[PDB]
Amino acid sequence: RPGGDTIFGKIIRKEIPAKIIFEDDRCLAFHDISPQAPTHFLVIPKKHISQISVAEDDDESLLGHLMIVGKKCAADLGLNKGYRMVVNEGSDGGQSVYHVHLHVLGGRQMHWPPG
Amino acid sequence: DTIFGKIIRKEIPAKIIFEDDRCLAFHDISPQAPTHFLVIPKKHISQISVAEDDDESLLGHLMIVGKKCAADLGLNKGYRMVVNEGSDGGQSVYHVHLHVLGGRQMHWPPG
Numbered sequence: 146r147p148g149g150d151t152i153f154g155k156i157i158r159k160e161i162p163a164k165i166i167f168e169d170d171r172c173l174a175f176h177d178i179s180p181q182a183p184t185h186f187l188v189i190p191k192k193h194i195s196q197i198s199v200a201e202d203d204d205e206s207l208l209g210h211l212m213i214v215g216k217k218c219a220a221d222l223g224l225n226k227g228y229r230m231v232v233n234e235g236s237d238g239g240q241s242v243y244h245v246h247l248h249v250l251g252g253r254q255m256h257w258p259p260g
Numbered sequence: 261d262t263i264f265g266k267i268i269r270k271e272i273p274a275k276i277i278f279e280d281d282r283c284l285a286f287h288d289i290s291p292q293a294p295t296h297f298l299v300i301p302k303k304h305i306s307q308i309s310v311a312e313d314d315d316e317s318l319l320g321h322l323m324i325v326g327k328k329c330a331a332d333l334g335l336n337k338g339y340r341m342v343v344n345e346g347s348d349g350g351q352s353v354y355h356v357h358l359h360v361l362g363g364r365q366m367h368w369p370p371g
């Protein structure tokens with residue numbers, strides 16, 4: 146079982162269902178089950194990195210790929226007026242699952258501060 | 261050009277936390293948490309929606325630099341990283357920037 150046994154690892158291996166938007170060899174984008182905006186999805190690496198704080202230097206291009214895929218998916222979903230991308234780290238950051246994930250939120254005005 | 265270009269060119273003051281050959285990290289002038297800094301590329305990418313495939317490594321570098329600076333600033337209970345795009349995202353400056361906020365409980369939703 147590669148991809149870990151967090152719920153996101155199970156999603157990567159298709160053991161638990163999800164609403165997939167995009168998939169490649171490095172990542173998976175799927176809709177969030179508790180959406181906080183009209184569109185709210187997640188981009189995750191297939192490689193299990195538990196949190197951004199423990200990312201390796203050579204995870205740079207993979208983390209960049211999360212953002213590129215996020216922005217492509219936002220465009221393909223028609224988020225023409227923009228969006229917010231969020232990574233949560235740890236307890237103060239509100240991280241809910243210990244597998245790195247980029248939130249992408251749009252279809253409404255996002256406010257400041259970002260929580 | 262933007263105010264962030266001015267900051268990169270060292271034409272206006274900013275409290276710089278880290279610099280390398282391709283990015284700059286500095287405290288946000290209107291902080292929304294006890295720690296609130298930005299990591300920006302020196303290359304002028306106006307918004308993440310127009311970033312190119314070849315920019316992947318650079319964008320990843322912003323996040324690795326952000327996470328290293330966060331550790332160095334003592335953000336051991338965690339933090340939140342944010343990129344805003346366009347009007348709905350609340351993007352305030354048309355130069356790509358990664359926010360890093362911590363030192364307090366961040367809430368949900370994230371705006």
Ligand SMILES: O=C(NO)c1ccc(-c2nc3ccccc3c3ccccc23)cc1
Pocket residue numbers: 152161162163164175176177178179187241242
């Ligand atoms: O307890 C939690 N936070 O404190 C929590 C953490 C993960 C999921 C969760 N997220 C998802 C996001 C996108 C797609 C599917 C799911 C999903 C599917 C089945 C069971 C749980 C989840 C739900 C709740």
